[PDB]
Nucleic acid binder design. Sequence first.
RNA 1: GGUCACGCACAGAGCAAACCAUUCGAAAGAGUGGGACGCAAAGCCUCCGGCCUAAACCAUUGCACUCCGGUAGGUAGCGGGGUUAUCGAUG
Length: 90
Amino acid sequence: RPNHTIYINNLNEKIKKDELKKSLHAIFSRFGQILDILVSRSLKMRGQAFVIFKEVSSATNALRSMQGFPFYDKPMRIQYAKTDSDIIAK
RNA sequence: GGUCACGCACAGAGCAAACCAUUCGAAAGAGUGGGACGCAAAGCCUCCGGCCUAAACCAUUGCACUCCGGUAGGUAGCGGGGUUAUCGAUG
Ligand SMILES: Nc1ncnc2c1ncn2[C@@H]1O[C@@H]2COP(=O)(O)O[C@H]3[C@@H](O)[C@H](n4cnc5c(N)ncnc54)O[C@@H]3COP(=O)(O)O[C@H]2[C@H]1O
Ligand SMILES: [Mg+2]
């Protein structure tokens, strides 16, 4: 089940691309190094993000401590990405 | 002269990117001034593609990695197309 990348939905959709990333970056650094934060505001990708960590444990630490963490008036829903991000698959 | 098409010229004339001041806008970006990178339509119009922005309304609780909802805007100096225009070495 666990993977380097964590899936995050129930995010506020009204947030910009620049802001959203900067805000997630500031939050999840507590758990390890983030290689890149994948945020797009396309129809299917609104209110969700992907955070890719250095080690898998970093994602686990993040996932277990931030579940339902009220971020921008909304408690986050965090789960592991079911498929490895294209950066890791390389 | 009128006209179909075209740009290797020749005669004029014109337009003005960047950057800056300044206003309008949530933004993309536009107006007005100063500026000239360049433009044969860099006059004009969003009808066809694309790109950009997304404040509001609407839809959306969605596993993406090329981007990509409806609608709203922008860009004609991204292309197509429509339209009007200076010169004729040109077909
Ligand atoms: N439709 C036309 N009517 C009359 N003459 C034409 C023409 N198309 C081309 N030419 C002639 O050929 C020259 C080169 O044209 P080009 O388009 O390659 O290169 C041109 C063009 O790209 C640009 N340019 C100049 N004036 C322009 C304008 N009024 N509108 C658009 N672009 C212009 O600067 C270049 C040099 O200008 P320049 O007049 O000295 O030189 C031009 C012009 O004399
Ligand atoms: Mg001349």
